[PDB]
Point group: C5
Chain length 103, copies 5
């Protein structure tokens, strides 16, 4: 049921510690809102941290992303993300599609 989103331009990066709305969020050029995952323990805290790095990276640089998201929230929750440099003819990678065409 995991949803693939492709070629998102992230334009807004949000840190928020207000209760009932804490966590990190991104906003798409078209106003898609997603929440970034989070994790205390190894090994996901590695990946959730790199989610934050990647997300910042796009908003700062204009770079595109590809998201494996859950439309079982609102804002949705980013379950995996791919950062892509300019000059890539294709959008998402085949390896990235396949992994989310599974959960």
């Amino acid at each position: 049921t995991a949803s693939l989103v492709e070629g998102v331009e992230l334009t807004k990066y949000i840190s928020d510690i207000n209760n009932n709305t804490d966590g990190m969020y991104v906003v798409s050029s078209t106003g898609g809102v997603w929440r970034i995952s989070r994790a205390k323990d190894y090994p996901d805290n590695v990946m959730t941290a790199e989610m934050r790095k990647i997300a910042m990276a796009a908003v700062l640089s204009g770079m595109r992303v590809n998201m494996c998201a859950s439309p079982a929230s609102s804002p949705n929750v980013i379950w995996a993300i791919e950062l892509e440099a300019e000059g890539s003819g294709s959008g998402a990678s085949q390896f990235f599609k396949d992994n989310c065409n599974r959960t």
Copy 2:
């Protein structure tokens, strides 16, 4: 009571260990002074880490920020911060505003 500040251009980043006045601080083009939140434990240490990350990116590159600030202290504390790209975006995002106007 939370304030909402928009299209702030941050010009300065301050680290301070002098007694009382210790913490992180950002100063806007208009001379406005805010204090970056902090926390020791999971999960907010992540958000306040990214909060520190966003304040530098803004300062180092000039991108605009939107903040949910508590006016209850001087300088005001930052409770949420939204880093926004030069692709405009109509100022602050609705997702941000919605959560600043809800406390």
Copy 3:
């Protein structure tokens, strides 16, 4: 059997906490999929952190890498990455070639 792959251009960088696929992955302009290595404890958490930084950096800039990946599985796990600025003709360092060819 750890092979040496020279002069890669990486165009995608992937965080993923999908179960049974969770990890860091890099993709070449050509499609090659690799899995960044991962480690909990000192001293290799410092190294896997630095390939993560090296992965991200090659993605953002376009500078080549040279890798030392294990063909033992798919995608090939990365055991030793080496970044390189645009000097000479993007060759792999003799030091790195040799250390790679000793497993």
Copy 4:
């Protein structure tokens, strides 16, 4: 006796793990040399980390920094630093001159 140095251009940055000489230092264009404070605990370990990040930012990009250092030892220890975007360049923020003219 705390001192306020303004508009400094940091052109060098030293990590050094040789005994007693160990610690982190910055050097201006004039050869003036300062020492970054250290701390092991929350929250000052946040602020000293941000101090180091500021110092590396200036050196890399040659932006100026204002410093609040303690003359009681040599090199001076930085008790507060302020990284400033190129543009305002009006000296230090009033806020930062006022916190160091009270210790």
Copy 5:
């Protein structure tokens, strides 16, 4: 028996977790090879980390370094490093020079 190295243009940043060759390495344009120092505990875990940030910045930007490395072992491990700009020379700072003739 420590040995100052000045004006070193680093061209290659290396992470490696292969057994009996793991660590962090840098390589100069001429082809010289140093190990980056590692450390687990406070405070050298701060200095070693900055050491690694300094490499991830000179390889990236072409900025020159100065080194104090121990010839006591294979790829002489770096005991101190100075990230500098290219203003005029630059040389090394006297502060750095005077710290190196120590061990």
